[PDB]
Amino acid sequence: STGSATTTPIDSLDDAYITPVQIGTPAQTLNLDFDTGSSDLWVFSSETTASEVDGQTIYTPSKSTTAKLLSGATWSISYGDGSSSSGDVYTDTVSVGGLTVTGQAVESAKKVSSSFTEDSTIDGLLGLAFSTLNTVSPTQQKTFFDNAKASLDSPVFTADLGYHAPGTYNFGFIDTTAYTGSITYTAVSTKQGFWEWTSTGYAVGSGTFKSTSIDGIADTGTTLLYLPATVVSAYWAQVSGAKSSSSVGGYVFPCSATLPSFTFGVGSARIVIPGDYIDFGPISTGSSSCFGGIQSSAGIGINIFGDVALKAAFVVFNGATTPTLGFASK
Template sequence: MGFSNVTRVPVRRNGDYKANGTKSLVWLYNKYNITPVRPGRYHRDKKHRLMKRQEDGSSTEVTAEDQQNDVYYTCPVAIGTPGQQLEVTFDSGSADFWVWSSHLPDEIKKRGAESGAAIYDPRKSSTQQPMPGSTWHIQYGDGSSASGTVVTDIVKVGDITIQGQAVEIANRISASLTTQTASQGILGLAFGNINTVTPKPVKTPLDNMIAQDDIPNDQEIFTCYMGSYKDAKDPDHGESFFTFGNIDSDVVNATGREISYTPINDTNGFWEFASESVVINGKKIALPGNTAIADTGTTLMIIDDDLVEEIYSGIPGAKYDETEQGWLIPSNTPPDQIPDVAFAVGDVEIVIEKEHIAFAPAENNSEMVYGGIQGRGKLPVNIYGDTFLKCVYAVFDAGKKQFGVVQRVDPSQKIAF
């Protein structure tokens, strides 16, 4: 892939990440408060708690061990003066910018240091300022949480320097989160109305890039190019990156197409847009009123459960597995036996590359692969994570309140792992 004059913020793959389809799906159940509708071990009880059915028939509450904190990708940011570099997850599905800090208990800092995790120490920065009275608390669906206080400091993302950015520093994180040391925090790229800082929400890094004119008035955007390790031999070498304030014209030109835009609805804080049809093997199914959320912090793609069944029922040997809580396909399935699937993004149809319909080896069956598209349960909206994002170059346009995509060309399709 050629290089334009746009600064790319590199995305790094977590070398220790072992993809697990069921755990990624359970992570989504928690992130979006989903109630599953298909039979399986995971279900909601009468108090709406997510539960796991044991072999003896009893149920226990879901723990961090049952889900995968989807930190496959991280991006470098520098905080403070001099800059302290941390690896964080760029997440378009949340709006908090929080990081591991020197305020954490010594035992947690020690455990993190042993695994190579960096922390932000505000005392070592000459530009940090406390925000007295401001606190934050994020509760995850498995009962784990992170909380702390807030400071402002200089934050550098790529070639952009943000002045006075609110940094939510962790004073406490649940023990379960300390195992996720590849990412030392989250940089939320959703809309600020879902920021959790009290008594008053703070501006996100993207908000401040716009307010401080760090990015052009006509390009109040960030873009996302997610690669796949399966494509190491392709022209893009499976690389991934984000850009801020610029569209990478080299990427668009390589597609031979133009970016298609559709309006977004940010009422709920998300990058939500119309996705009102799906095409499966040439059969177009209308989905009037259906919407989807683009989520860079999620690996899977989840859609209506009946549509999921329609996709996988056409694959020889594919089956729904209650133990895995999802659809599996045989690992030796040739690409021509996987259906052609395309989802509408506004007025354009985006084809899901067949290799991304094969997400990860099944946990309990070495001859099967966990599907990258699964059911959304009772959630009324689709979630388009990496399964979708690896097929497009995506433009998140906060200024014009629109979401843009252009279909990428993938010359090879690798189903097996």
């Protein structure tokens, strides 16, 4: 089997991407944030505290003839931006782009933090990291991909995120028309539960490539590119007036600037992030200070190849017995 679904930016800045997901019988379609950095499929639901729902579409298990309470199971998750959610668990039928999993754990939110409430466009998350990170207790549950894997034509999914445009998530096949040149594959460590890999270095604009190992994660659920302070300083030093602002919470730059590109290494291959991808616009409405899309990972504890990086490539998440990551230009 295979599946193919379109993923769409939630706003004009590509702050996140939503992908329609069919849950239950008859189908209830929710727009979920596919997140290769976590491993819980959770939704706004009929159980979510009413004051914490503001415009989201909810899953109502009592209206699904295939929903079954997973008795005794609870979940609770916290993300790197300080947001969180928690609740109980149902199993139900879940389909993405024509690919159907029966008995998928659907984590029903009883509580969500303010950031989720305030984002009316995201109805929940669909985790695509390794199932070892799944938070369901006392019986850990598998991700949608893990459950689908054996049925897929090939044990892979691909992320093809657009810049200010829709893109695609495919399951079970590689669309050879969706990228240019060849795909360069690179080793993955699953020791921390992530799609963790090591970039071979970077360049700023038309500058020379610096060979240096940068360990990080391929994370579709993180907006920006978070790299070591040395790398980030080298980037922003090429932008007149750019500075790190503790009051804003990162690097800002004059909105009048033309940003240089940023290149990252994948083995001997190179992915180029155009300067425009690094512009996240005014820090507040009307401001002439703009927020940068490359930020320091210092104090996160991990480097994160988020959407800013991933949307510059066609990315293969290879879930074979020894997982790997592939990157191609597009």
